[model samples]
Target chain A: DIVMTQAAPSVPVTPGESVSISCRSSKSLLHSNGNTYLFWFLQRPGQSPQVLIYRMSNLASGVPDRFSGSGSGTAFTLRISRVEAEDVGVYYCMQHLEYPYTFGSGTRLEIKRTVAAPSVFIFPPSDEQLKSGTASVVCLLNNFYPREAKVQWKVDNALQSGNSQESVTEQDSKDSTYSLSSTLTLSKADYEKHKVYACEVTHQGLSSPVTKSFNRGE
Target chain B: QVQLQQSGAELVRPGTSVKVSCKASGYAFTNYLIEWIKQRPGQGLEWIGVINPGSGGTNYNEKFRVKATLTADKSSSTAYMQLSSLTSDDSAVYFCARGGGYYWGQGTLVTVSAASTKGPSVFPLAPSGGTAALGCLVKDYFPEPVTVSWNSGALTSGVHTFPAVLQSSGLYSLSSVVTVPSSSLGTQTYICNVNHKPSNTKVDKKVEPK
Candidate 1:
């Protein structure tokens, strides 16, 4: 089975900036027919995947000249020049060199001007959790761009090891920013033992990670 | 304030047929275009077809033209998709979205069953965050509704269980996580306990954080 791996998870670009997304295949994609069986695709927000380039570097019919593909046997690149707001979407690379065809993990393209750091907030333990003698700390990351972020919980002064499940990220139809929710549940005794509970977020728009803390104070 | 309300889930036998409905409200339904989409379990979305409610004009993706039938009633503001000759491949969540993909219905899950009941298989996923977080994946179960507990429910509040999802193979899958303080890592031998009611089975899988 061939595996196509896309290196960049996302690319943030200005309106007129040129950008390239890279993909590498585990095996050579060269076919006996003298063609590299590689393809590039773009899926705009809330839409379907549209082929951009096929057979390594040939642009699909009707695709603009600003969209181009270039590559060899294993390494491939899809370049877009003078990107516009309409280019805001996810890009994917595919390989058809073998029996089990494979596609790269998608790369999101976002306009830098529209990107903003997430505002992290930690909600106090809910009444139900408090009554159950446990504390469920809820973290919300609201109004962020590009939709993907890493979240972590901190107890006292150290990062927690406990499991945290993030809700499916939601993109606002109005503003195009994203929102997400995560919860960390622990015993009330554990919560009392800790002086501070923090929710930390790392996003592409942030120069440094953001942390919001819940300090237990009388 | 455009709104779309879809019908409920369907569980049926192979080779049968099922029709799902999506009703539109809070807008001039006849003026907009309605599109039907298909999403197989653990897979990406595929466009099935589109319909213009006012004109009753329709267009379909070639891939689904034969397997799916799309129709709409402008009077009721409802869109319907009837899948014929149902098979495992047709068991997916079907959705109705507005033209241009803005408004969408909560998808309807269609499960084409093989009529055999089976217990789920549970496996422990590797612990992350230095043993503070670990996961259990329960797969290939018949009849949804499974319960997951960590260490005999010693950490009840910390367990996060996802809803069971139907699989393409006519079975269901679920996942759960256990979050704990780093202090509990290394010293404790954690057990993932799963209970499936229909099969009357209980599974206990153990994992130790290093």
Candidate 2:
């Protein structure tokens, strides 16, 4: 098994500052065919770590392009452009190419928030219809000014929580531009009632919660 | 998604045993191997062993030498492990891990309480009339930590100790011999008590003149 080690114990990056972590393996994780199976993970405190990169350089399913991973053979790097508040946590690199897989010690990404402001925006909801009797709603937000926001869903002013609804945000090319989206799939009964489903966006500087509602398709 | 659903919590008295099962779904019965792990509440993870459902061959951790036995049924895609000689120290949440740690079933906590029928074994040893030294052999099924004690019915700890040895299959075997003066060995039976935390089961076998 290749031994993976992280370069820095921790890195302090202010919001909108770029930061990177290096993962070096004792033996090249590169396969005989010349492909490395290195991966990068970001574990926000109190949550299961999320995969940021896999197979050395390719992004894992549902990962944002802003969370870029590059490098190969014995060395790999996970670079985040314009660090956000949500990105403040420990980042780890792992290699699954070898038996008894290994993980780096992890690098803590801390945010330097100089000012508290409305750093997030939500718009242009993306939708996906699934065969599993549900639809996925996605909200895209860009150029989040302060980089701290949460997306949640509400129906009839009551919180609807389940595996069917989820929220995610991604950074755009321009600084302060972010895409935030939330999705909720109701059953045939909930859909028929024309219940108003709202996506609530929360941040520090916002006067009132930003909510976007949608009715069942006609 | 294939899921390995496991049983609920079990409360076994000390000196007793309990068995748990893991039922598989959404996958071929004989296709994959099921691994088991032990996690004491809020503790680090330990790999207990792996069982090949197709052939029933098992590989266990060196630490779980005699504490666990793995078995499986191909027809039902179910795997079972029987844990014996329970004690308070043995109380922990055991989980059925799958896909080489990619997935895990909700763990089943096994708590050991009051003492029960089955317990550790104690061996009594006495050398032949003329011999000054006597050897005692004892075998343990699991590889958990255990202690061998020599007592003249007063329950005192022994000096000589041998590290537990592992068989090819990962089970443990240990032996220790104490020298006693034949003059004072009239009818005395020195006891070798196997002490394991949580459940101390002793086996007593006489080693007197034949």
Candidate 3:
């Protein structure tokens, strides 16, 4: 019966930046027993809102430990620590322990400046063609617009830094469209069943965080 | 991706009626049933009823009583419900929902502004000398107001009638008296006709000499 509204239309964030979202209820969420019931969710682009926190402050199952929620009564907040590339998306807060449940206005998190050109990188070349020697992967950024993009590679789920990679950006002197490319190398064992190779593309002004993954075949 | 776009807000005068509509889009409208719900500004949600567009079967919440009536038009893929005898207490936001709460339409707020009417009246106790008083409480929107009449297997005259009284609560009550012959001790019939309009109907309750 109570009306709930979000304060902001969007939220901006840069790489490694922390963010906090507020959820307010029209009436006190405090029950007669003195407990507040509220929840927070994050709805990445093109995905459903995932429950991040529930019962005011408890985190939902599988949610990263870095995400923390704290508040009381009619007011609550959700904070994301060390915002990663995968964290770029819209976030919403929901309260359901009451009748007529509602969701807060969503906040969009965007990257400030892409360190490198955005690209799609492949690992171990062809999974069936592995030879136990040093394996390499290629990252490609095709027909990219806006010109500002960063590409990062992850080997077996771990961030890869200082890896040998190349980048080429072309600006169409006429229409101004740009394209970029990069590549990374990994050991053959890194493509094993328990391992995964991930390539991420970060572009300025784009809310969507593009990612692709490849694994070694038995 | 079926979507329901409901009509805008409405303001109606008291004693009058207001009808709202919900337009369906996206998929074939007949695929799902449309249900209506009511929510006051600061009150809990109430399930008004549902309408099956294909079969036209409907079930309403008992509490709604005569407050809501649901109907649909297959050709237009639209469902409509009309609320009659508008009162300030009837002010609320109405919404159309799909089965299982999967989809919902934007709500439309209705404000009833008509002047309130009086409620039913209380009749004095009937004496023990073969005479009794009866009253019928009637609401508007029903065809002819309900009537209190007497019968003894034969038409009888000289039934005493009282002026109808209207209460501040928007209800009307009428009362009348009937006297039985001294010879007819234990046999007498009095009926209350609850005139329902749009369909001339009546519900009768008999009162035996006590």
Summarize candidate 2's per-residue lDDT along B49-116 as a digit string, tens digits: 78889988888766676999989998888889888887777788787855344445777778675523
**Candidate 1, residues B70-188: lDDT per residue as tens digits?**
88998899999999889889888888878644467878888787687789876555342222556566767886657888888886744556656555456776667655666767677
The model with the greater lDDT, 2 or 3, is 2
Best prediction by lDDT: 1
Worst 10 residues of 1 chain B by lDDT: B123-132
Name model 2 segments beyond 4 Å from true: A7-18, A39-52, A65-71, A80-84, A87-92, A106-218, B4-23, B33-52, B55-73, B76-97, B100-210
Clashing pairs in 1: A161-B132, A162-B132, A162-B180, A163-B179
Q: Where is the poorest 10-residue window by lDDT in model 3 chain A?
A: A168-177
Cα error, residue A127 of model 3, in Å, equals: 37
Overall lDDT per candidate, in order of appearance: 0.74, 0.60, 0.59
Please list, in the order the candidates appear, how each scores on TM-score for chain B only: 0.66, 0.54, 0.53
- Model 3 stretches astray by more than 4 angstroms: A115-218, B1-210
lDDT per residue for candidate 2 within A11-111, as digits (tens), equals 76777789888889988887877778787776553233457787777777677777888886888889898777667667878776655456677777755
The lowest-lDDT stretch of 10 consecutive residues in candidate 1 chain A is A167-176
Every model's DockQ: 0.04, 0.01, 0.01
First chain TM-score in every candidate?
A: 0.59, 0.51, 0.52
